[PDB]
Design an enzyme around this catalytic site. Structure first.
Site, short mmCIF file in Angstrom:
data_model
loop_
_atom_site.label_atom_id
_atom_site.label_comp_id
_atom_site.label_asym_id
_atom_site.label_seq_id
_atom_site.Cartn_x
_atom_site.Cartn_y
_atom_site.Cartn_z
N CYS A 173 0.84 -1.21 0.00
CA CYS A 173 0.00 0.00 0.00
C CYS A 173 0.87 1.26 0.00
N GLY A 218 9.82 14.93 26.61
CA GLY A 218 9.60 14.22 25.34
C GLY A 218 8.19 14.39 24.77
N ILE A 247 2.25 13.95 27.62
CA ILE A 247 1.51 15.20 27.56
C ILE A 247 0.84 15.36 26.19
N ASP A 287 6.31 0.35 33.55
CA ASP A 287 7.20 -0.79 33.57
C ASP A 287 8.45 -0.48 34.40
N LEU A 319 11.68 16.64 39.74
CA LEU A 319 12.62 15.54 39.95
C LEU A 319 13.93 15.92 39.25
N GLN A 368 -12.73 1.78 -1.89
CA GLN A 368 -12.73 0.63 -2.81
C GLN A 368 -13.99 0.67 -3.70
N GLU A 427 -15.01 -0.75 1.50
CA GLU A 427 -15.94 -1.25 0.49
C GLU A 427 -17.26 -0.44 0.55
N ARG A 441 -21.55 -16.32 2.89
CA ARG A 441 -20.23 -16.86 2.57
C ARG A 441 -19.73 -17.78 3.71
N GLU A 480 -7.91 -12.98 -0.48
CA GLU A 480 -8.59 -13.46 0.72
C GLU A 480 -8.24 -14.90 1.08
C1 LIG Z 1 4.16 4.52 21.85
C2 LIG Z 1 4.41 4.60 23.34
C3 LIG Z 1 4.84 3.47 24.03
C4 LIG Z 1 5.07 3.48 25.39
N1 LIG Z 1 5.44 2.34 26.03
C5 LIG Z 1 5.56 2.35 27.38
C6 LIG Z 1 5.95 1.17 28.15
O1 LIG Z 1 6.15 0.10 27.56
N2 LIG Z 1 6.07 1.30 29.49
C7 LIG Z 1 5.90 2.45 30.18
O2 LIG Z 1 6.06 2.46 31.45
N3 LIG Z 1 5.56 3.58 29.53
C8 LIG Z 1 5.39 3.57 28.19
N4 LIG Z 1 5.04 4.73 27.54
C9 LIG Z 1 4.85 5.98 28.31
C10 LIG Z 1 5.88 7.11 27.99
O3 LIG Z 1 6.70 6.89 26.81
C11 LIG Z 1 6.85 7.32 29.12
O4 LIG Z 1 6.08 7.46 30.35
C12 LIG Z 1 7.82 8.49 28.94
O5 LIG Z 1 8.95 8.13 29.75
C13 LIG Z 1 7.35 9.86 29.36
O6 LIG Z 1 8.46 10.75 29.26
P1 LIG Z 1 8.40 12.15 28.47
O7 LIG Z 1 9.71 12.86 28.63
O8 LIG Z 1 7.85 11.86 27.10
O9 LIG Z 1 7.25 12.81 29.33
P2 LIG Z 1 6.39 14.16 29.09
O10 LIG Z 1 5.12 13.69 28.49
O11 LIG Z 1 7.10 15.36 28.56
O12 LIG Z 1 6.05 14.46 30.65
C14 LIG Z 1 5.34 13.44 31.36
C15 LIG Z 1 5.00 13.86 32.80
O13 LIG Z 1 6.17 13.97 33.61
C16 LIG Z 1 6.23 15.33 34.10
N5 LIG Z 1 7.67 15.55 34.18
C17 LIG Z 1 8.58 15.30 33.22
N6 LIG Z 1 9.81 15.53 33.69
C18 LIG Z 1 9.68 15.93 34.95
C19 LIG Z 1 10.62 16.36 35.99
N7 LIG Z 1 11.94 16.36 35.76
N8 LIG Z 1 10.04 16.71 37.16
C20 LIG Z 1 8.72 16.68 37.37
N9 LIG Z 1 7.79 16.32 36.49
C21 LIG Z 1 8.26 15.96 35.27
C22 LIG Z 1 5.42 16.21 33.20
O14 LIG Z 1 4.97 17.43 33.88
C23 LIG Z 1 4.35 15.24 32.81
O15 LIG Z 1 3.30 15.21 33.76
C24 LIG Z 1 4.82 4.70 26.14
C25 LIG Z 1 4.42 5.87 25.46
C26 LIG Z 1 4.19 5.84 24.08
C27 LIG Z 1 3.80 7.10 23.39
N1 LIG Z 2 0.75 4.08 24.06
C1 LIG Z 2 1.44 2.97 24.24
O1 LIG Z 2 1.62 2.23 23.29
C2 LIG Z 2 1.94 2.56 25.64
C3 LIG Z 2 1.74 3.40 26.73
N2 LIG Z 2 2.15 3.10 27.99
C4 LIG Z 2 1.45 3.77 29.12
O2 LIG Z 2 0.07 3.39 29.12
C5 LIG Z 2 -0.72 4.44 29.67
C6 LIG Z 2 -2.18 4.20 29.33
O3 LIG Z 2 -2.89 5.25 29.99
P1 LIG Z 2 -4.43 5.07 30.42
O4 LIG Z 2 -5.01 4.34 29.24
O5 LIG Z 2 -5.05 6.36 30.89
O6 LIG Z 2 -4.45 3.93 31.57
P2 LIG Z 2 -3.93 4.07 33.08
O7 LIG Z 2 -2.67 4.90 33.32
O8 LIG Z 2 -5.16 4.40 33.89
O9 LIG Z 2 -3.64 2.54 33.52
C7 LIG Z 2 -4.65 1.61 33.10
C8 LIG Z 2 -4.34 0.33 33.87
O10 LIG Z 2 -4.12 0.72 35.21
C9 LIG Z 2 -4.59 -0.34 36.07
N3 LIG Z 2 -5.65 0.14 36.97
C10 LIG Z 2 -6.18 1.39 36.95
N4 LIG Z 2 -7.09 1.52 37.91
C11 LIG Z 2 -7.17 0.34 38.54
C12 LIG Z 2 -7.93 -0.22 39.67
N5 LIG Z 2 -8.83 0.60 40.25
N6 LIG Z 2 -7.74 -1.52 40.05
C13 LIG Z 2 -6.85 -2.29 39.42
N7 LIG Z 2 -6.10 -1.84 38.38
C14 LIG Z 2 -6.20 -0.57 37.93
C15 LIG Z 2 -5.04 -1.46 35.18
O11 LIG Z 2 -3.87 -2.28 35.07
C16 LIG Z 2 -5.42 -0.72 33.92
O12 LIG Z 2 -5.41 -1.54 32.76
C17 LIG Z 2 -0.04 5.67 29.05
O13 LIG Z 2 -0.29 6.87 29.73
C18 LIG Z 2 1.44 5.31 29.10
O14 LIG Z 2 2.04 5.82 30.29
C19 LIG Z 2 2.80 1.92 28.21
C20 LIG Z 2 3.04 0.99 27.20
C21 LIG Z 2 2.63 1.23 25.81
O1 LIG Z 3 -18.53 -12.58 -1.91
C1 LIG Z 3 -17.99 -11.50 -1.53
N1 LIG Z 3 -18.68 -10.32 -1.71
C2 LIG Z 3 -18.22 -9.12 -1.28
O2 LIG Z 3 -18.92 -8.03 -1.45
C3 LIG Z 3 -16.86 -9.10 -0.65
N2 LIG Z 3 -16.09 -8.18 -0.03
C4 LIG Z 3 -14.99 -8.82 0.39
O3 LIG Z 3 -14.01 -8.23 1.02
N3 LIG Z 3 -14.99 -10.12 0.11
C5 LIG Z 3 -16.17 -10.40 -0.49
N4 LIG Z 3 -16.77 -11.52 -0.93
S1 FES Z 4 2.62 -1.48 2.73
FE1 FES Z 4 2.83 -1.23 5.00
S2 FES Z 4 0.80 -0.55 5.83
FE2 FES Z 4 0.68 -0.84 3.65
#
Ligand SMILES: Cc1cc2nc3c(=O)[nH]c(=O)nc-3n(C[C@H](O)[C@H](O)[C@H](O)COP(=O)(O)OP(=O)(O)OC[C@H]3O[C@@H](n4cnc5c(N)ncnc54)[C@H](O)[C@@H]3O)c2cc1C
Ligand SMILES: NC(=O)C1=CN([C@@H]2O[C@H](COP(=O)(O)OP(=O)(O)OC[C@H]3O[C@@H](n4cnc5c(N)ncnc54)[C@H](O)[C@@H]3O)[C@@H](O)[C@H]2O)C=CC1
Ligand SMILES: O=c1[nH]c(=O)c2[nH]c(=O)[nH]c2[nH]1
Ligand code: FES
Ligand code: FES
Lengths: 1297, 49, 98, 49
Positions: free
Chosen positions: A110, A232, A236, A332, A376, A740, A775, A853, A1234
């Site tokens: 794509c 980063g 936020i 984590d 911090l 499509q 579709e 189907r 498909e």
């Molecule tokens: C695609 C994706 C995947 C992710 N995967 C994970 C994951 O696997 N596990 C996980 O735990 N998290 C995950 N996260 C969460 C996120 O990436 C992290 O929490 C990241 O470390 C936040 O850092 P930042 O600098 O981007 O924060 P920002 O968003 O800039 O700030 C975050 C918060 O920290 C505060 N802050 C920042 N620095 C300070 C400081 N020095 N003092 C006081 N307050 C401060 C800000 O005021 C804000 O409230 C994911 C996020 C995304 C977008």
């Molecule tokens: N975007 C991404 O791909 C990734 C993001 N992160 C983190 O994931 C966060 C997701 O944020 P939100 O969706 O707002 O969820 P969140 O920060 O509220 O956490 C949701 C989770 O918290 C726990 N939880 C919350 N309240 C609870 C309760 N009362 N009892 C038991 N468990 C409870 C559960 O494990 C629930 O699934 C992001 O802010 C980021 O820090 C981490 C990994 C991947």
């Molecule tokens: O028999 C089909 N008709 C559709 O309209 C359609 N659309 C699709 O994704 N597969 C199929 N198969």
């Molecule tokens: S070729 Fe990667 S999403 Fe389409």
């Protein structure tokens, strides 16, 4: 100051009025016109927006390069950096090696994800010109691809690796010359000497301060503690974009030296709170390599978490302090910092304190014990001590880039020389509203010896101490509890082994060798791939490309970001933006709408509702849908109206200011709700043959059960998008659409407007994926935007955000099936009755055809003499479900394989023998009485079972399972039969139009749309053979209703079949007209014939058309052929499950697929892999969760987990069947899109075999619903742990729909 | 001639494969197409008038 | 179209040829990607040439509709067309004249 | 044609023509043209692909 200055592709940018809310993605695309960088999700998951940043790092004193998500980078964070986009490395005039290799290796289908993947690989090469295979794979943890199935991308890029008839030739790839990369802008090196001054940017709503010193930061935070720190922006940005929070004062402290330093102390390593996780990673890796193992236990724990923590783009800018202070319950890092007592330094103006992370640091949800004025400064990650051991654990839905269900740090310290516990800390995320310590369980174990009694004591304490409410956020309560015990078990065993290595084996005991595999850190063999296909005849012209692996015609432009998708089209100067306003209730009356807040947003134009529709508010395939809700809403996501404003930002703000008041009405959500209310789309559908009563009476055995199959979101990387351009005359409008289905788009627009179809033109150049989801459901955007254009007289545009698209546009149908199968002791099936129910949601759409189907495929590959299937389509208050690649086929066939699996187990016979002896043979009739001619399935079977060495591998699997208690393997081989042609006969038609211009060049168009399947490529191959001229002289630009009318959707895998014939016929008409000129000048070139015809006044334009003959099934008489021919294929897959976590590896898959004489084996193998991997998602990873009140929770890649680079079978082999021409389709090919998808069930049934083995280890015919996620796998591996962790009613987080 | 509308062209490049779409006040779409294609060195099939 | 009412004349011609009202026929524009290799609009000839072109394209459509006309000689144009479409009969044609 | 809205990124062209019936072009100087706000480029024969 207040000027923002940065570089883009070597060109200086001076922005005098930077708004802090402006992302780099928006600035690149809308302000600078550079549209190669794409919007795929807006939340850091997909990588489609990946770009490279270069800067002079003042602290390391050198030029650095790293990747970021442009979708989350505030431009205000980018002062004095240099951005490189896909456009900055190469173009089709001179491709960068990265661009060349992904294109020529068939790694772009794509094309929407290609620029981002290009930029991830490019950045890696700028940092490491000789990467390993492992490094290459790691480059893409933050990149998603929905089309390719990842294999070609990795295989193409393996050519860069230190340790790296065919589909492509690596020997023709031009070499890398790093001297030829873009210069680091000289001006930035000169500015490196100037001290950094504080900056202030003021936007419409937000003020951004870029603080240069700690003093300025602390001063600011004392005087305005409300000032929001942003480093980063990876939290936020999400808070602002998706949780509609607004922090009107932001301070960015990223420049400040003290927040960026790394200091080695006697107790450990101190990282400034603004240090990126990429730097934590590189520093800890170096320390782990050079320090003694005894000192690095905590460091390796952190590193284990960071492995499965986002991708490179996020880790480049995400700060360690940002993660700590966000204080998500599923952090984590916080569990590891709590378990290790990591030392945090906090400061404000005039204050400075030091604390140990314990329970009191997190006093509440997303709270820390920082004072409002405090920041911090740093965190010290400690060295481990002698006798101190550490493990970190994470289990999510998918290994790569996912939110933990449970995450944990665990530390034990032993009294020296002993196995007696001095300290024990067990800390968890995902078990409460904060990171918690098991402070009631661990005191009790102090002074105990590390033994079975301690293991059993800690597990019983954890089961009691870590309770979860049935309604706990995130659900999966049984799984989560089970993980806490299972993680502790692994830690327990690991510590035994670590004591072993400390020479205390005599005191604690040896690990049983069948337990060893439980403690292994996740590891994959390197990938191995095979593609086999058939060479064309020796005699075939080198200019005849039919059957040759010609790359997708747009691959080079997709790699360069020059390929144009809908939103890449420049805006007209008078163009407006539209935003849909959708129902937040599953079923309610609309009591009133207040637009008073919407009217105050700058640039607001109008709010459109049903009253504004000029003609008809009745739309949809079966005319049962509203354009805009009138009086009542019937799902969460039902479109009520549309805001029109100048910009997408103002349209979003104005949409939030449309306040809707509702009165709830009885909601029907689930399939059971619908049965209980007799809420269905039409009557029962039924196929039946033979005598069911006889068959069941004759059966040696009868087995009954149910199966539930979860739905699926398409996740096309390009969301739905329409531009409507009104022409101001006679109702004329032109629409540019990612769809499509140009015909239905045109029809629905024209009926809504009340103008004839001849006034409306719909143009599709290409889509970034469709897969069925475009579709029909594209039209809900198209109609809205057309109305806006009509009302205003101005072009209007709408591209959906991922959350909006996932909510509004629906998905694959969840199915519930009740089956009863009668069979002999030999495994021969003699009777089958299956009742199917689907959840259709709130309009009919394609639901009834999908069920047809499913019924047509309830046999899968199996002759069943006495058979009855029924289907009912449930009408519910959910978004309308629609086509998804397979269109009911996969659901029907999973059910078939599921009861077949139970037949084999009940008979105690090898499943492959039971499937083989039930398989149809050549000439048999299906249950719907269609004869199976050219039945290649036994050849596919025999070839696959032999080339995969299935029998020999079965022996290895049995051996592994006898020697491992806590990991198990399974192995399964699955066949498929898939009927080719629309279920609605008359849709089996297509048309083309061809012109030959007087220079001899040919402009071709047809009804098919390009969505990454290489349709245009195939039609060019076809036309080139038919006209006997090179592909180079033939071009396809686009698809349009005003060149070919009345077209069927690009759907049912049939579009190459239908358009190929149309194209062929158009070409034949042209050749007939040129015959006399060819006869007069049999040598003289094509160009002379053309010019001679032209100057002889002979037409060089022709239409072509095809309809598939002899189609038309009757449900009443169970007669007539629904299908023109069938596709056939077999897959054998092997898995290894982790019985303690539910994770698994896809070890190996081997596919043999009948694609007839392939038009293009490169494209067809790509369709096999891409379809297979979507099926792998359907059956093992992809799960949509809904509130009990019918609101979709799962609205982006963070929660909806499609296959990642790391998901695919490690060994992945694909063979196209040799010598199997299918002469009833174009040039003896078969359709491919498909049919391969269902073959991923091989992985589902391999998992089911592995679970069976685990269950024998620690109830026969156990339940495994789809998808077989880590939750379902883990819960089904019953053991001493699940026993200790196992209420109506009782509302919970989600309801099964 | 003194056509009340003078000569006028808008040319819209598509950024792919030399493709270009022209909106023209002309009696002669064919020679417009031909002459543009020859000048650019692309086939007639890339140019729409 | 340069003010000489060529599209007006071609709609009049098509309406006679097809035997439907002018209201059901529209011309939007002239484009090299719908009709190739066209002579200039010149030599006073354009209604002569294009009128024949139009007439032939209309005769092709009529020939394709005539089985549906025979089976419903009264039923309206709209039913003939929808019957042809659901019988998978092409409703697009070129026409040419020299 | 000119009534069609401009794209947000659309540029404007002006032809430069001969003020002599028959002559050699001895030189062309664009220094004053380059000073005009919004100037992009001056195309000549050498720019023809
Ligand atoms: C695609 C994706 C995947 C992710 N995967 C994970 C994951 O696997 N596990 C996980 O735990 N998290 C995950 N996260 C969460 C996120 O990436 C992290 O929490 C990241 O470390 C936040 O850092 P930042 O600098 O981007 O924060 P920002 O968003 O800039 O700030 C975050 C918060 O920290 C505060 N802050 C920042 N620095 C300070 C400081 N020095 N003092 C006081 N307050 C401060 C800000 O005021 C804000 O409230 C994911 C996020 C995304 C977008
Ligand atoms: N975007 C991404 O791909 C990734 C993001 N992160 C983190 O994931 C966060 C997701 O944020 P939100 O969706 O707002 O969820 P969140 O920060 O509220 O956490 C949701 C989770 O918290 C726990 N939880 C919350 N309240 C609870 C309760 N009362 N009892 C038991 N468990 C409870 C559960 O494990 C629930 O699934 C992001 O802010 C980021 O820090 C981490 C990994 C991947
Ligand atoms: O028999 C089909 N008709 C559709 O309209 C359609 N659309 C699709 O994704 N597969 C199929 N198969
Ligand atoms: S070729 Fe990667 S999403 Fe389409
Ligand atoms: S659009 Fe930025 S990661 Fe998806």
């Amino acid at each position: 100051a207040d000027e923002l200055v940065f570089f883009v592709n070597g060109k200086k940018v001076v922005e005098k009025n930077a708004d802090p809310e402006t992302t780099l993605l928006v600035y690149l695309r809308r302000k600078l016109g550079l549209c190669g960088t794409k919007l795929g999700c807006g939340e850091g998951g997909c990588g489609a927006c990946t770009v490279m940043i270069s800067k002079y790092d003042r602290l390391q004193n050198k030029i650095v390069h790293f990747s970021v998500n442009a979708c989350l980078a505030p431009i205000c964070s980018l002062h004095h950096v240099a951005v490189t986009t896909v456009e900055g490395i190469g173009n089709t005039q001179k491709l960068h090696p990265v661009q060349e290799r992904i294109a020529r290796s068939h790694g772009s289908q794509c094309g929407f994800c290609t620029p981002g993947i290009v930029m991830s690989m490019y950045t890696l090469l700028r940092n490491q010109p000789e990467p390993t295979v492992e490094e290459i794979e790691n480059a893409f943890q933050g990149n998603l691809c929905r089309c390719t199935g990842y294999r070609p991308i990795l295989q193409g890029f393996r050519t860069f690796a230190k340790d790296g008839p065919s589909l492509f030739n690596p020997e023709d790839f031009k070499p890398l010359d790093p001297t030829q990369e873009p210069i680091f802008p000289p001006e930035l090196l000169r500015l490196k000497d100037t001290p950094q001054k504080k900056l202030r940017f003021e936007g419409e709503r937000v003020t951004w301060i870029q603080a240069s010193t700690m003093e300025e930061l602390l001063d600011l935070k004392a005087q305005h503690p409300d000032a929001k720190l942003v480093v980063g922006n990876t939290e936020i940005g999400i808070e602002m974009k998706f949780k509609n929070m607004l922090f009107p004062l932001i301070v960015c402290p990223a420049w400040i030296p003290e927040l960026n330093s790394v200091v080695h102390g006697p107790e450990g390593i101190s990282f400034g709170a603004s240090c990126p996780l990429s730097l934590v990673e590189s520093v800890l890796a170096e320390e782990i390599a050079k320090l003694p193992e005894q000192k690095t236990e905590v460091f390796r724990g952190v590193m284990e978490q960071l492995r499965w923590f986002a991708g490179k783009q996020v880790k480049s800018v995400a700060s360690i302090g940002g993660n700590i202070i966000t204080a998500s319950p599923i952090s984590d890092l916080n569990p590891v910092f709590m378990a290790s007592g990591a030392k945090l330094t906090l400061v404000s103006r005039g204050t400075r304190r030091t604390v140990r992370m314990d329970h009191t640091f997190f006093p509440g949800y997303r709270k820390t014990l920082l004072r409002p004025e405090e920041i911090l400064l740093s965190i010290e990650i400690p060295y481990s001590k002698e006798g101190e051991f550490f493990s970190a654990f994470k289990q999510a839905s998918r290994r790569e880039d996912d939110i933990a269900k449970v995450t944990s740090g665990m530390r034990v310290l032993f009294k020296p020389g002993t196995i007696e516990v001095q300290e024990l800390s067990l800390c968890f995320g995902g078990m409460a509203d904060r990171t918690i310590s098991a402070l009631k369980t661990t005191p009790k174990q102090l002074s105990k010896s590390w033994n079975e009694e301690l293991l059993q004591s800690v597990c019983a304490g954890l089961a009691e101490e870590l309770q979860l409410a049935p309604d706990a956020p995130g659900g999966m309560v049984e799984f989560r509890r089970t993980l806490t015990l299972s993680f502790f078990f692994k830690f327990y065993l690991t510590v035994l082994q670590k004591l072993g290595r400390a020479d205390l084996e005599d005191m604690c005991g040896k690990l049983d060798p069948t337990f060893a595999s439980a403690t292994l850190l996740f590891q994959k063999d390197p990938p191995a791939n095979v593609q086999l296909f058939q060479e064309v005849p020796k005699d075939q012209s080198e200019e005849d490309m039919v059957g040759r692996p010609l790359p997708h015609l747009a691959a080079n432009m997709q790699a360069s970001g020059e390929a144009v998708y809908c939103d890449d089209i420049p805006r007209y100067e008078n163009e407006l933006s539209l935003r849909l306003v959708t129902s937040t209730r599953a079923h309610a009356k609309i009591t009133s709408i207040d637009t008073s807040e919407a009217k105050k947003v700058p640039g607001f134009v109008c709010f459109l509702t049903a009253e504004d529709v000029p003609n008809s508010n009745a739309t949809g395939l079966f005319n049962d849908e509203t354009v805009f809700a009138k009086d009542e809403v019937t799902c969460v996501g039902h479109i009520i109206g549309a805001v029109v404003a100048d910009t997408p930002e103002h349209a979003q703000r104005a949409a939030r200011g449309v306040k809707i008041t509702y009165e709830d009405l009885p909601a029907i959500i689930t399939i059971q709700d619908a049965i209980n209310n007799n809420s269905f789309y039409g009557s029962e559908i039924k196929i039946e043959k033979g005598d069911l009563k006889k068959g069941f009476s004759e059966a040696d055995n009868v087995v009954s059960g149910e199966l539930y199959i979860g739905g699926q979101e398409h996740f096309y990387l390009e969301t739905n998008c329409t531009i409507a351009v009104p022409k101001g005359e006679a109702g004329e409008m032109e629409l540019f659409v990612s769809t499509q289905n140009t015909m239905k788009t045109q029809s629905f627009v024209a009926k809504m407007l009340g103008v004839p179809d001849n006034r409306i033109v719909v143009r599709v150049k290409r889509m970034g994926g469709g897969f069925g989801g475009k579709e029909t459901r594209s039209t809900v955007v198209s109609t809205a935007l057309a109305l806006a254009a009509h009302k205003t007289g101005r072009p209007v545009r709408c591209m959906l955000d991922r959350d909006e698209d996932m909510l509004i546009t629906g998905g694959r149908h969840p199915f519930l099936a009740k089956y009863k199968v009668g069979f002999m002791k030999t495994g021969t099936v003699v009777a089958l009755e299956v009742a199917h129910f689907s959840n259709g949601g709130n309009t009919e759409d394609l639901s009834r055809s999908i069920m047809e189907r499913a019924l047509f495929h309830m046999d899968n590959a199996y002759k069943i003499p006495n058979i009855r299937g029924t289907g009912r389509i449930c009408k519910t208050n959910l978004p309308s479900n629609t086509a998804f690649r397979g269109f009911g086929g996969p659901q029907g066939m999973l059910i078939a394989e599921y009861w077949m699996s139970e037949v084999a187990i009940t008979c105690g016979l090898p499943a492959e023998e039971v499937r083989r002896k039930n398989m149809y043979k050549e000439g048999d009739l299906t249950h719907f009485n269609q004869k199976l001619e050219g039945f290649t399935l036994p050849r596919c079977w025999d070839e696959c079972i032999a080339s995969s060495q299935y029998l020999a591998r079965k022996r290895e699997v049995e051996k592994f399972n006898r020697e491992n208690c806590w990991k198990k393997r399974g192995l399964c081989i699955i066949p498929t039969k898939f009927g080719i042609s629309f279920t609605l006969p008359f849709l089996n038609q297509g048309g083309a139009l061809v012109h030959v211009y007087t220079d001899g060049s040919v402009l071709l168009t047809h009804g098919g749309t390009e969505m990454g399947q290489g349709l245009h490529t195939k039609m060019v191959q076809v036309a080139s053979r038919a006209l006997k001229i090179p592909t180079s002289k033939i071009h396809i630009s686009e698809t349009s209703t005003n060149t070919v009318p009345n077209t069927s959707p690009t759907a049912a895998s049939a579009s190459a079949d239908l358009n190929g014939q149309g194209v062929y016929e158009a070409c034949q008409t042209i050749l007939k007209r040129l015959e006399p000129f060819k006869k007069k000048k049999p040598t003289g070139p094509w160009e002379a014939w053309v010019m001679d015809a032209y100057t002889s006044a002979v037409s060089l334009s022709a239409t072509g058309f095809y309809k598939t003959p002899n189609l038309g099934y009757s449900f009443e008489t169970n007669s007539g052929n629904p299908f023109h021919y069938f596709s056939y294929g077999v897959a054998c897959s092997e898995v290894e499950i982790d019985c303690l976590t539910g994770d698994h590896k896809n070890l190996r898959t081997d596919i043999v697929m009948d694609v007839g004489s392939s038009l293009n084996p490169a494209i067809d193998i790509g369709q096999v892999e891409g379809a297979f991997v979507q099926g792998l998602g359907l059956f093992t990873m992809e799960e949509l969760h809904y509130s009990p009140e019918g609101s979709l929770h799962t609205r982006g890649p963070s929660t909806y987990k499609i296959p990642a680079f790391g998901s695919i079978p490690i060994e992945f082999r694909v063979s196209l069947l040799r010598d199997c021409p299918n002469k009833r389709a174009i040039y003896a090919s078969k359709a491919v899109g498909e049919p391969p998808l269902f073959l991923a069930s091989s992985i589902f049934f391999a998992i089911k075999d592995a679970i069976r083995a685990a269950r024998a280890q620690h109830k026969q015919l156990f339940q495994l619903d789809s998808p077989a996620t880590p939750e379902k796998i883990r819960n089904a591996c019953v053991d001493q742990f699940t026993t200790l962790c196992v209420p109506e009613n009782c509302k919970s987080w989600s309801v099964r729909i």
